[PDB]
C-alpha cells in the first residue's frame, strides 16, 4: 500500500549515506540491490526515523528514542511479522484488529509495559500463543478466563499489582503448571474454598508478611507446609523450618490445631 | 518483611531441582582458523 | 592506482570488462576508447543514474528493461534518441520542450496511449 508524504525527516538518509555511501539521497534503493542480498549487518544501531521500517522485513532492533515523534499508529499495517522486540516504559495501547488476521508470530518480549486492558474471549482461538513475559506486568484489571486453557506458560508474575479476583474455572485444569507466585497481593474479597484446590503446584509464596492469619486462612498454608516441608528452600540464606510461620500472635504453628 | 528483600540473587542448586539447570560442561572448542597449518595432523597409522 | 568509491555499478562494469575478453589486465584505460560503444546491448540493464551525462554525448539509443524506472530525468535532456521502448504503464503526461531539436528520430512505438486529449501544434514542426 504505497503512500506519499510519509517521511518528514531525513535521519534514514543520513544512515544510508553512512552505510551504503551512495551518491545522493534521491537515489532510490534499486531492485537489484534488494533482490541480490537478503541480510543486513549493522549491530547496536540508534536509528531515529521510525518510518520506512514497514517496507524492510529485516527488523531486529529498534531503539525508540524520538522527541518529535507523537504517533504510535504507524504499526497498524503490519501483517507479515514473525519476531517482535521493543523498549518503552510509557507505552499504553496499540491498534486493535491485528490478532485476527495474523497467525504466524511465535516470540514476543515486553518489559515494564502498561497494557491497561486486553479484549475478552480472544486468546481462546489463538491457542498457539505459548510464551508471555508476565514480569512487572501492570494488568490492573483482568478479564475472566485468561490462563485457564493456556497451560504452556512458564513464568507467571503478578508482583506489585491489585488482583482482587481470580478467573472463573481456572483450577479445574491446573495440573501441568510449574510455578505460580501469589506474593505481593492486595485483594479485598475472595471466595471460600478457591485457594484450597491449589494442590498440584510446586512453590508457594504467602509467608513472611504482617498479613492476617485467621483460621481457616492458614489451614491451607499449614497443609502445604506439612505436605512440602523438605522441598521449599529459601533463596535468602536463612533457616528453613522457622521461615514460614503464622504471623500475628507469633505462637508456634505446631501447637495450633484449628478447631472446627 | 514489607519492602525489604535482597538486591542480590543466587543460583539455588538442589538435588531435587529441575534436571535442566545443572551446569553442563559444554566446551566451545573454538577452532580458530588462523593461518598457521601444521604438518602432523595424523599418525599415518603404524599397521603391523 | 586503484581508487575506492568511484564505480556505483558492479554488474555493468564486470560485464564490460568480461564480454570484450581483453588480452590482459596490464593495459591502460581511457574514456574515448572505452566509449566507442553507442548502443548498449546488456540484457535487463537497469542503469538509473544518468545525471551529469553531458560528458558522454555519443550515446543515442538506450535500452532499458526497467519497469521500475519512472524517473522523468531520463527524458529531461535526452533529445538525441531515435528509438523509444519504455514499459511505463502509468504514463499520464509527456515532457514538453524536447521537440526543439528532435529531427533524427525515425521509428517510435507508443503503445497503451491513454491520452484522451492532445496538445496543439505537437506535430507541427515534424515535416
From Swiss-Prot, chain B:
Source domain of life: Viruses
Region (Disordered): 35-48
Impact upon substituting residue 9 to N: Reduced host ACE2-binding affinity in vitro
Effect of residue 6 to L: Increased resistance to neutralizing antibodies and human covalescent sera neutralization
Effect of residue 17 to T: In strain: 19B/501T
Effect seen on changing residue 17 to Y: Increased binding affinity to human ACE2
Listed result of changing residue 35 to P: Increased resistance to human covalescent sera neutralization
Consequence of changing residue 2 to V: In strain: Omicron/BA.4, Omicron/BA.5, Omicron/BQ.1.1
Effect listed in the UniProt record for changing residue 14 to R: In strain: Omicron/BA.1, Omicron/BA.2, Omicron/BA.2.12.1, Omicron/BA.2.75, Omicron/BA.4, Omicron/BA.5, Omicron/BQ.1.1, Omicron/XBB.1.5, Omicron/EG.5.1
Quaternary structure and partners: Binds to host ACE2. RBD also interacts with the N-linked glycan on 'Asn-90' of ACE2. Cleavage of S generates a polybasic C-terminal sequence on S1 that binds to host Neuropilin-1 (NRP1) and Neuropilin-2 (NRP2) receptors. Interacts with host integrin alpha-5/beta-1 (ITGA5:ITGB1) and with ACE2 in complex with integrin alpha-5/beta-1 (ITGA5:ITGB1). May interact via cytoplasmic c-terminus with M protein. May interact (via N-terminus) with host bilirubin and biliverdin, thereby preventing antibody binding to the SARS-CoV-2 spike NTD via an allosteric mechanism.
General function of this protein: Attaches the virion to the cell membrane by interacting with host receptor, initiating the infection. The major receptor is host ACE2. When S2/S2' has been cleaved, binding to the receptor triggers direct fusion at the cell membrane. When S2/S2' has not been cleaved, binding to the receptor results in internalization of the virus by endocytosis using host TFRC and GRM2 and leading to fusion of the virion membrane with the host endosomal membrane. Alternatively, may use NRP1/NRP2 and integrin as entry receptors.
Name recorded for this polypeptide: Spike protein S1
Parent-protein residues present: 485 to 532 of 1273
